[PDB]
């Protein structure tokens, strides 16, 4: 479910927040996301 506050357990990465579609350019080997202060930003859906 997107555009709604949900607890996520993406591949063992636990957390809380809101998810949606993105236009990122993940390289095929890229799996996680982060920012300049090292906080997980984007998670590649393991089943999508």
């Amino acid at each position: 479910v997107k555009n709604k506050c949900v607890n996520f357990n993406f591949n063992g990465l636990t957390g809380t927040g809101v998810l949606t579609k993105s236009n990122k350019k993940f390289l095929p080997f890229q799996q996680f996301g982060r920012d300049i202060v090292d906080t997980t930003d984007a998670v590649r859906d393991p089943q999508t």
Binding site: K24, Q30, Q31, F32, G33, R34, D35, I36, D41, A42
Partner: peptide, 24 residues
């Protein structure tokens, strides 16, 4: 047979340390 001449690597041989996307 083979040779063992020496050259400079210049700026080359940098990989992605992790599998974590980053921008700007």
């Amino acid at each position: 047979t083979t040779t063992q001449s020496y050259t400079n690597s210049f700026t080359r041989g940098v990989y992605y340390p992790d599998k974590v996307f980053r921008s700007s």
